[PDB]
Every structure is written in C-alpha cells, then in structure tokens.
C-alpha cells in the first residue's frame, strides 16, 4: 500500500507530529512541504529493505491472532508468525 | 587399520580393478541381450 512507512511509523501520526512541531516553532511553507516529502521518502516501505516489510507483516499477523493484547507465543500466533517468514 | 594392514586392502582393491579391466569385453558380451 501507497503511504505505508517502515521503522514502526504511521503516516497519519507523522503528519500530526510535524504539525505539532510547526505549531511549537510558531509559538517560539513550500520548504516545509519539501522537507515533509523528503522525510516520507526516507521512511517509506518502497525505499526501505524487505526485512522491515516482513517485520510489519509479522506484527499484523500477531495482532490478528493474539487471544489477548499481550499474546506472543500463543501456539496459533506462533504458527502465524512462522507462516509470514515461510 | 595401521598403514601396513591397509596396504593389503589396497593391493586387493588394485587386483580387483585389474580383473574388472581385463573382463570388460567379456562383461559387455554377457550383459547385452540376456
């Protein structure tokens, strides 16, 4: 998917963070947009390694299968984690 | 196996190889069509 990020980031959260930073700076446009674009490019999946994508897939699988929030090691979740790698 | 003992085995293996070399045409004749 098109605006998915690596390194355990989320695009919606990143934009919000950037906005908050901007607000803080103001308290204390084109260029800013360009910087934001550069950041997105850096943190995009499609520029990053396959390893990050796999990790993300594993995390997703865990989220799906976990019989409660903490579960890692549920036989089913372990199997799911194995599957992505396989 | 010491080396001395091995040498008898080696010799035997060589003899066997020689026999096989000798009986190549004979073996071929025996093999085909029966």
């Amino acid at each position: 998917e098109p605006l998915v990020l690596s390194k355990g980031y989320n695009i919606e959260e990143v934009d919000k963070f950037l906005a908050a930073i901007e607000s803080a700076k103001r308290e204390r446009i084109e260029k800013l947009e360009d910087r934001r674009e550069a950041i997105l490019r850096i943190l995009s999946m499609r520029n990053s390694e396959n390893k990050n994508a796999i990790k993300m897939a594993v995390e997703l699988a865990r989220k799906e299968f976990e019989r409660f929030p903490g579960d890692t090691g549920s036989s089913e979740v372990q199997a799911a984690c194995m599957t992505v790698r396989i | 196996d010491s080396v001395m003992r091995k040498r008898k085995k080696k010799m035997k293996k060589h003899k066997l190889r020689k026999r096989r070399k000798r009986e190549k045409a004979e073996r071929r004749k025996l093999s085909q069509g029966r």
Binding site: K7, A38, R41, I42, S44, N47 | -
Partner: protein
Amino acid sequence: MLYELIGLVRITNSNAPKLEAKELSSTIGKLIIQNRGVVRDIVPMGIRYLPKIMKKDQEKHFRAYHFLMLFDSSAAVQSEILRTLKKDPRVIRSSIVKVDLDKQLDRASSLHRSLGKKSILELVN
C-alpha cells in the same frame, strides 16, 4: 535506504577541472530525485592524483576529481544508478556502499564519521 557513493570523475580540461564532476553530480542527483530518492549531502573531495595510471575503455587517467554523494533510494534504484555510473565515459572508478539505518536515522558520510561527527546535526552545528 541510505547509500553512500564514491565517484572518481574525469578531468579533461586543465583550467576548469570541476565542470565534468559537477555535471555528473547534477545528473545522478536528478536521477535519484526522479526515482523516489533523497540526496542528503554532496561532499566534494580534492583534485587528487590516482595511485596508478588507471584506464577506462580506450583512455588513460593519472589525476581525477573525487566526491561523495550520500543519498537515500530503493535497492533497485541504487543498482541502476550504479549501472549508469559504470556505463558513462567520464568516471574512472565508482563505488556505492550501504550505510546501515537499523540503529539511527541521521547518519553522516563515512569521512564525517571518521572525523568525529556521527550525525549530520553535528556537522550543521
């Protein structure tokens, strides 16, 4: 993926040596940016003499202009950039090498790290 580059460009013209280098830097930087990439730094290095008389196809070179380009890209993009470098007649030696971002995000060029400055923030300050 942060890839460092080291290209040793040709210097045919005696009086104005850096022009070919500058053109190379422009072109490869343009390619990078067209292909989802982000060039971070373009560190120049001097008009340094080569160790031996290094030769390209039907040419010979004894002095060259050296530079680092420290850019982000995909792997396929990087590979293609490398291929384009290998192809062109105005570079003697090219070398892309990965800079690992598993620990940090801001990473300076190899030279800057050797000097002392780990991140580009330090260089800025």
